[PDB]
Design a protein around this ligand. Sequence first.
Ligand SMILES: [K+]
Ligand SMILES: [K+]
Ligand SMILES: [K+]
Ligand SMILES: [K+]
Ligand SMILES: [K+]
Ligand SMILES: [K+]
Ligand SMILES: [K+]
Ligand SMILES: [K+]
Ligand SMILES: [K+]
Ligand SMILES: [K+]
Ligand SMILES: [K+]
Ligand SMILES: [K+]
Ligand SMILES: [K+]
Ligand SMILES: [K+]
Ligand SMILES: [K+]
Ligand SMILES: [K+]
Ligand SMILES: [K+]
Ligand SMILES: [K+]
Ligand SMILES: [K+]
Ligand SMILES: [K+]
Ligand SMILES: [K+]
Ligand SMILES: [Mg+2]
Ligand SMILES: [Mg+2]
Ligand SMILES: [Mg+2]
Ligand SMILES: [Mg+2]
Ligand SMILES: [Mg+2]
Ligand SMILES: [Mg+2]
Ligand SMILES: [Mg+2]
Ligand SMILES: [Mg+2]
Ligand SMILES: [Mg+2]
Ligand SMILES: [Mg+2]
Ligand SMILES: [Mg+2]
Ligand SMILES: [Mg+2]
Ligand SMILES: [Mg+2]
Ligand SMILES: [Mg+2]
Ligand SMILES: [Mg+2]
Ligand SMILES: [Mg+2]
Ligand SMILES: [Mg+2]
Ligand SMILES: [Mg+2]
Ligand SMILES: [Mg+2]
Ligand SMILES: [Mg+2]
Ligand SMILES: [Mg+2]
Ligand SMILES: [Mg+2]
Ligand SMILES: [Mg+2]
Ligand SMILES: [Mg+2]
Ligand SMILES: [Mg+2]
Ligand SMILES: [Mg+2]
Ligand SMILES: [Mg+2]
Ligand SMILES: [Mg+2]
Ligand SMILES: [Mg+2]
Ligand SMILES: [Mg+2]
Ligand SMILES: [Mg+2]
Ligand SMILES: [Mg+2]
Ligand SMILES: [Mg+2]
Ligand SMILES: [Mg+2]
Ligand SMILES: [Mg+2]
Ligand SMILES: [Mg+2]
Ligand SMILES: [Mg+2]
Ligand SMILES: [Mg+2]
Ligand SMILES: [Mg+2]
Ligand SMILES: [Mg+2]
Ligand SMILES: [Mg+2]
Ligand SMILES: [Mg+2]
Ligand SMILES: [Mg+2]
Ligand SMILES: [Mg+2]
Ligand SMILES: [Mg+2]
Ligand SMILES: [Mg+2]
Ligand SMILES: [Mg+2]
Ligand SMILES: [Mg+2]
Ligand SMILES: [Mg+2]
Ligand SMILES: [Mg+2]
Ligand SMILES: [Mg+2]
Ligand SMILES: [Mg+2]
Lengths: 118, 50, 126, 145, 134, 206
Amino acid sequence: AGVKAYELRTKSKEQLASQLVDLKKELAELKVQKLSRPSLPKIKTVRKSIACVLTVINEQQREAVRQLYKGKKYQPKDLRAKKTRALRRALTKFEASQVTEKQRKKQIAFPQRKYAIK
Amino acid sequence: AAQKSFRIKQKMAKAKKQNRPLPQWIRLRTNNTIRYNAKRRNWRRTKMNI
Amino acid sequence: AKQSLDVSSDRRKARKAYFTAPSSQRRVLLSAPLSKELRAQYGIKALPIRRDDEVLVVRGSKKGQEGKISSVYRLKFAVQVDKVTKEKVNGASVPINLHPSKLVITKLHLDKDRKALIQRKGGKLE
Amino acid sequence: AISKNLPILKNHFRKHWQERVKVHFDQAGKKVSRRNARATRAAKIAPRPLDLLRPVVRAPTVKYNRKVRAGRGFTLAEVKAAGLTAAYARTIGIAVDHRRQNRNQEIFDANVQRLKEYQSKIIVFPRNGKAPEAEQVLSAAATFP
Amino acid sequence: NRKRPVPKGATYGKPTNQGVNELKYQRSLRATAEERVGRRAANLRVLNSYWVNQDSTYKYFEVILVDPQHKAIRRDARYNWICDPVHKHREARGLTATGKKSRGINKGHKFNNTKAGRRKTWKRQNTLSLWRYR
Amino acid sequence: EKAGHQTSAESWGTGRAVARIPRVGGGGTGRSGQGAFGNMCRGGRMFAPTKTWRKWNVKVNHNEKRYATASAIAATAVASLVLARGHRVEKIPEIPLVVSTDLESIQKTKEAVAALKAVGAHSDLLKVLKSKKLRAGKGKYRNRRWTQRRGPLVVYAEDNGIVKALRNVPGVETANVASLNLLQLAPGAHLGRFVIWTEAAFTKLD
RNA sequence: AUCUUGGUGGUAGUAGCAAAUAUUCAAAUGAGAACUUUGAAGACUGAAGUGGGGAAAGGUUCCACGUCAACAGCAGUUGGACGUGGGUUAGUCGAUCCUAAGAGAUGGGGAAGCUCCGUUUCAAAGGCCUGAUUUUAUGCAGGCCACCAUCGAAAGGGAAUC
RNA sequence: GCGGUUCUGACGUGCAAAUCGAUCGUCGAAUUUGGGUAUAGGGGCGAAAGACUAAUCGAACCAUCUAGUAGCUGGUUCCUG
RNA sequence: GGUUAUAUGCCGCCCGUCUUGAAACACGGACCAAGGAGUCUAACGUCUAUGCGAGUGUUUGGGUGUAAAACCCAUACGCGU
RNA sequence: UUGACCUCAAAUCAGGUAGGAGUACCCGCUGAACUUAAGCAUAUCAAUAAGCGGAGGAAAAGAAACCAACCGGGAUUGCCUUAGUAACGGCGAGUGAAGCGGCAAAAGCUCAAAUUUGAAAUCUGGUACCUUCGGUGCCCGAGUUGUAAUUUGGAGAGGGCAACUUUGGGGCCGUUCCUUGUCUAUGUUCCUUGGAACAGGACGUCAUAGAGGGUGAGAAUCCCGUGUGGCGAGGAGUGCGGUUCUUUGUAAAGUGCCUUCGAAGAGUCGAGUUGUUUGGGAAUGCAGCUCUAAGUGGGUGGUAAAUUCCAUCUAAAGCUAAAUAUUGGCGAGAGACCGAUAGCGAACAAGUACAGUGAUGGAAAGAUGAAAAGAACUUUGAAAAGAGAGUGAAAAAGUACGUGAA
RNA sequence: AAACUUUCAACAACGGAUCUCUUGGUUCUCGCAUCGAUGAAGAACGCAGCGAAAUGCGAUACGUAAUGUGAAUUGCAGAAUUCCGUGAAUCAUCGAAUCUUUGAACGCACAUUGCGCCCCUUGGUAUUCCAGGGGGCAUGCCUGUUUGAGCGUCAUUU
Ligand SMILES: [K+]
Ligand SMILES: [K+]
Ligand SMILES: [K+]
Ligand SMILES: [K+]
Ligand SMILES: [K+]
Ligand SMILES: [K+]
Ligand SMILES: [K+]
Ligand SMILES: [K+]
Ligand SMILES: [K+]
Ligand SMILES: [K+]
Ligand SMILES: [K+]
Ligand SMILES: [K+]
Ligand SMILES: [K+]
Ligand SMILES: [K+]
Ligand SMILES: [K+]
Ligand SMILES: [K+]
Ligand SMILES: [K+]
Ligand SMILES: [K+]
Ligand SMILES: [K+]
Ligand SMILES: [K+]
Ligand SMILES: [K+]
Ligand SMILES: [Mg+2]
Ligand SMILES: [Mg+2]
Ligand SMILES: [Mg+2]
Ligand SMILES: [Mg+2]
Ligand SMILES: [Mg+2]
Ligand SMILES: [Mg+2]
Ligand SMILES: [Mg+2]
Ligand SMILES: [Mg+2]
Ligand SMILES: [Mg+2]
Ligand SMILES: [Mg+2]
Ligand SMILES: [Mg+2]
Ligand SMILES: [Mg+2]
Ligand SMILES: [Mg+2]
Ligand SMILES: [Mg+2]
Ligand SMILES: [Mg+2]
Ligand SMILES: [Mg+2]
Ligand SMILES: [Mg+2]
Ligand SMILES: [Mg+2]
Ligand SMILES: [Mg+2]
Ligand SMILES: [Mg+2]
Ligand SMILES: [Mg+2]
Ligand SMILES: [Mg+2]
Ligand SMILES: [Mg+2]
Ligand SMILES: [Mg+2]
Ligand SMILES: [Mg+2]
Ligand SMILES: [Mg+2]
Ligand SMILES: [Mg+2]
Ligand SMILES: [Mg+2]
Ligand SMILES: [Mg+2]
Ligand SMILES: [Mg+2]
Ligand SMILES: [Mg+2]
Ligand SMILES: [Mg+2]
Ligand SMILES: [Mg+2]
Ligand SMILES: [Mg+2]
Ligand SMILES: [Mg+2]
Ligand SMILES: [Mg+2]
Ligand SMILES: [Mg+2]
Ligand SMILES: [Mg+2]
Ligand SMILES: [Mg+2]
Ligand SMILES: [Mg+2]
Ligand SMILES: [Mg+2]
Ligand SMILES: [Mg+2]
Ligand SMILES: [Mg+2]
Ligand SMILES: [Mg+2]
Ligand SMILES: [Mg+2]
Ligand SMILES: [Mg+2]
Ligand SMILES: [Mg+2]
Ligand SMILES: [Mg+2]
Ligand SMILES: [Mg+2]
Ligand SMILES: [Mg+2]
Ligand SMILES: [Mg+2]
Ligand SMILES: [Mg+2]
């Protein structure tokens, strides 16, 4: 059938590591059997289980690190948002919104007015 | 060429694996138009140029 | 006549969109009309065909034959009914490919999702 | 290459002119876009008109000084005479131009008249609330010909 | 001057183009200065430059640069224009003061060739415009 | 612009017992040595490649367009011409055929079709239905698959339904009387379109 | 258009398939044997070989089993062909290390610039020894010397196998 | 081994886009040669023939400018009046 | 009587091309299919048709639209007077 | 001796940043020749190709050291005009702009030069905390060789007098804008032909839907869509319409009169000369070298010079949407376009196979049938195959597959 | 007379024209603005029950996670038909990951699968040797930190 990642997300770090090894053992066993038999398609299910478990392990370990840098200025580049190189170099909303005191005063004194012709 | 680089040997290994006729079951596939292996190479016909 | 600037009347584009339709899109392309019996019951003209729907053939050489949809061969844009078959000279029996627009569904294979679809189209269910 | 009694011609096609031919097939398309953009702008700016009020000026040169036409903007002097500051006027739909000078009482008086007629025929909404439904007139140029 | 960099003074063409000596680069020594500095400090933006000195062999300039990554510049409303990426390598495109001089970007009858961009102007004047209704 | 010239072909010159056309260089493929560039070569450039700056649209003096439109309108009121142009107006009583202004406010196709049959446009509608044919030639590949006759032109003064109600009837055009179109009044440059005027449109003509 | 691409003739069953001394008998195999295999015979290369190994180059051609449509300018049961597999084992043999003619970063200087020069220079150009301390394998304790990256040989130099 | 004199031999739709046979020059050095390395196109290299520089040389090869220009050669497609 | 094949009488050089002169001992053509060469554009001359006429030209643009169409239009500008 | 300062270094020091790609359009640099002139050198091709550097969704330009000479206009760009004109030119071939006028789009502004001097009022970083595109404390640092506030020539500043006017910043809910999902008519009724009805005939139905496509032949009505309208989901953004919280004000801005002032960019401008370039002609711009200013000054006013006026701007510092470009990228819609020797080189495992040491060069090649129903079985043959039989509407459709010319 | 040669027809060849077709091209219009040191474009080598390609992907390898759909995929094999469901699929979508060796390409090199050094850790009697696992070490430039250099230079104190 295969493992299901919603079931794995309940599990602990150690339980998952243990399961990962049981799958790696199982996969080896089938690689041997494949030599004898003509066709052996069960091996696909266990390849994908391994890949599932590693995905979940990595998710857990990353979310742990996201918590460790909660709120801190500077976090690992791999947890920073990707966007694009050019977007990451752009001025922030704050920087782009800055006006000098001279211009702030003019903007208050003389905003564009709403008006209509009759 | 007895004493050869790994890089050359790796390319030769690739060439070994590709040197085969088309698997017959491809011909049975729905809407198949591949008749034969059109990129087959032979040591007597065409050189690999490394 | 079309009015929307998003829709195309280009033949070439239409044919491309059909022949390269992915499996999901082909589901909708392979709809069949309900029988006039079932049209009363559910209040729906047509549905996407499904394995284990029962069917009547209403056009072609096998017009009149009935059976269950044994397979929806979306890749071939066709359905295979069990019992509609070709007796081959060697004695083997291959399925005939029928297009769902030439069938009529006489019994639906229902389930939570099919039921939800029927009520979604303003059907009745009972 | 010269023969018969024909005009001498001056067809300048000795450069690689076919690299730079612009056929205006987008004429109809550019007109639909321009119109959509007027509509879009009108909606963003509503109820304001799409144009600023502009002064009358005399065209220069002996060939066209018999005509008057719309100029760039009111003078600082005309805006002051109409009972208005440049900074305010800019915000109430009046084009102001610091470069143009008044040396002619007829054009000056006519421009001051324009500004008075304009301040009569607009309604400036207060910068808070209450805002009464005015209805958008798109052209100051058609209102104040 | 800029000596034409051709082997042994051979030019391989018509006599008008046989010059090698007495030719002159179309940008100023000031612009060369900004450009070479600009390449040494590619994280910075060249703002402007000025003459300080000369001998027979060299002219000396000082080039003012701004760091667009420094938060003192990014948060300054008067200077953060230079952070926008249109202003990358302004010295290389002729957009500094010395650049605009050498490109002939000025108003009036003396700058008809150049005021809008020499190449743009040329292209506009050598375009055949055909309407649908000719 | 690049078709036919994506080749480094050069003439071999005389002395090789071949024609002096440019030839593809190199070796090891069927294309090597073959004729190139010229209009007579397989794979070469067409003679005088078509260019986009051919004159496409044509200017016509406005006052001449108006003349033709007025002639076209005048001919709509001559039953001889309307018959000759293939309209089935044998059993209509009177051309010009004017009908009530009520036509302008019909909302449903079913109703608008009944009105056209009522006033004697049945045969001309039928003609359009029976005339659908697949187009001869490569036009079929180019989004012009079917062909059929033109039906009546219904002319109104104000559209309060009628354009949408006639949109789907094969061959029926509609038109505001303010903006009459020579391409509808004289299809194929043949005078005598069958026109059904509303009373309001007919008064507006003056 | 000695036109372009493709196809097809006559020529014609014609020119021809004649260098390197050379083949023969029997059996086996097989639908079929001048040509495959075995045996018998006759000859040749004649050790500056048609023998036994390698370098460059090739890249699986090596070996087995199956096997003949095409290819081996006759043939073919045979094959460097076709199909399917098997096969290359290192502390000691090479590479790897060293420098050669040379190539080439850096410091610098040229050049609008792609880049060019130059190779230890008009540079603040490093990295070892020993004890400890027992805090530790980093600062500390001492000392010591300072030349100038790097690449460049499967025939040069070179740790070690029969 | 390196060369290439004569037969003006073979061949001359070849075994071969330079070969074959015989005859011949030289054969311990201004010798022959492998590999590494340097020199690049108005450039190199040359015991010098305008030789050689990948079957290309009194200026290589590749692409582009380029559909270069041609007072010159060839061609230029249905009928009747 | 037509058609067609053949026979008989008389007649009939191979086309294309350049050329004063080609059947030429002038050139291209072994054969067959398919492709294959005065085009489009800017500005013009004469002539003709058409509209309006001391004027004329709606289409840069604006308005409108059943939306690259059709329909409507101010100020200029061009040519003319 | 101890501690500064200045200048210069080092570190796998803390945190960042550049490079390469694409390259249609855009900003520069560099820069040909073929070609034309019936020869050819100046000229032309061309301020083009090739080469190099640098950007963006646009770029650049841009709020006059402008145009003018008028009754004056008023940033830039683009279109129509100006105009094949003024002018340049072996005054040959050829080349060739600008002002005004009509339009599209429209938007304006910032520094330097000033004593906060009764208060460096300013800012990076680290650190703790928080409501985190950031905020608040605290601490080092930068900075007086000058960071803030104030002013930019249209002005404006300092004093003095007199008056009235106008304001900030949050959430929350609609609309907007984009990206998506889903629901929303009517015959598979009869006859004929056919392998198949989607054909013909008959009788209907829907139509704001008779666009288009599919299905065994020309299908509005068999299927998907189309038309109309409804209902969801996810963002983005205050653009602006409502509501709610906090009211910034001893603050900020605007305005009249009097008075004293009014800082305004140098190896620049300008000049000579050299080269290049321009329609720019005793010199249009650019650049090298030499010379090198002024402050009622300086520039321009398309014939050099002196003298006298006048007119017009305010250089040598800076930012800025839109109208404009676009053989590239992404997403769409179309065509009197081509229809497999055509159209992109490429309808196909095509920039592939293949050639070349390399740069590079670079093909051919689409169609059985509705459906494989792709010929069981028999027989001759070593076999390939034949002959039958069969499948199919047809093998005069057998994969050497539509038609099947010469 | 036959053969032979030639001409025409029928049937059969050869060959692939013609006709009909078209998920391709071409041109015009409209809208949009998004590559890269957070490792791009491009390259190499790999990966499927049975593939040589094309296409997809990276030792988690024709994919993993998430979301939507609601039962396939299909050449065969196999699996599954609690499929009235946290659920089929070469499905759509896509926000989380994985992403060999490379490449601007960054420890030094590269016709080498060549040779280093540093930190943490495990094993072998181990600070120093050998091995395994993890994580690091390019250049220019900016701001800052720290450690310094120079009779450049001030004060102070010998
Ligand atoms: K040259
Ligand atoms: K010259
Ligand atoms: K070419
Ligand atoms: K070894
Ligand atoms: K060695
Ligand atoms: K030379
Ligand atoms: K070569
Ligand atoms: K040359
Ligand atoms: K001549
Ligand atoms: K006869
Ligand atoms: K001739
Ligand atoms: K001759
Ligand atoms: K760095
Ligand atoms: K010249
Ligand atoms: K000019
Ligand atoms: K000059
Ligand atoms: K003025
Ligand atoms: K003056
Ligand atoms: K081709
Ligand atoms: K057939
Ligand atoms: K198309
Ligand atoms: Mg190659
Ligand atoms: Mg072509
Ligand atoms: Mg013979
Ligand atoms: Mg012979
Ligand atoms: Mg023999
Ligand atoms: Mg012998
Ligand atoms: Mg012997
Ligand atoms: Mg063997
Ligand atoms: Mg043979
Ligand atoms: Mg044989
Ligand atoms: Mg083999
Ligand atoms: Mg050894
Ligand atoms: Mg070097
Ligand atoms: Mg080495
Ligand atoms: Mg050795
Ligand atoms: Mg010889
Ligand atoms: Mg001889
Ligand atoms: Mg002979
Ligand atoms: Mg000689
Ligand atoms: Mg030609
Ligand atoms: Mg030529
Ligand atoms: Mg007779
Ligand atoms: Mg005779
Ligand atoms: Mg003669
Ligand atoms: Mg003749
Ligand atoms: Mg003769
Ligand atoms: Mg001749
Ligand atoms: Mg001949
Ligand atoms: Mg020929
Ligand atoms: Mg033809
Ligand atoms: Mg660091
Ligand atoms: Mg030319
Ligand atoms: Mg000439
Ligand atoms: Mg000539
Ligand atoms: Mg000449
Ligand atoms: Mg270029
Ligand atoms: Mg970009
Ligand atoms: Mg824009
Ligand atoms: Mg800009
Ligand atoms: Mg100003
Ligand atoms: Mg202006
Ligand atoms: Mg004129
Ligand atoms: Mg010129
Ligand atoms: Mg103030
Ligand atoms: Mg059909
Ligand atoms: Mg130049
Ligand atoms: Mg700017
Ligand atoms: Mg083609
Ligand atoms: Mg048939
Ligand atoms: Mg056939
Ligand atoms: Mg024949
Ligand atoms: Mg990677």
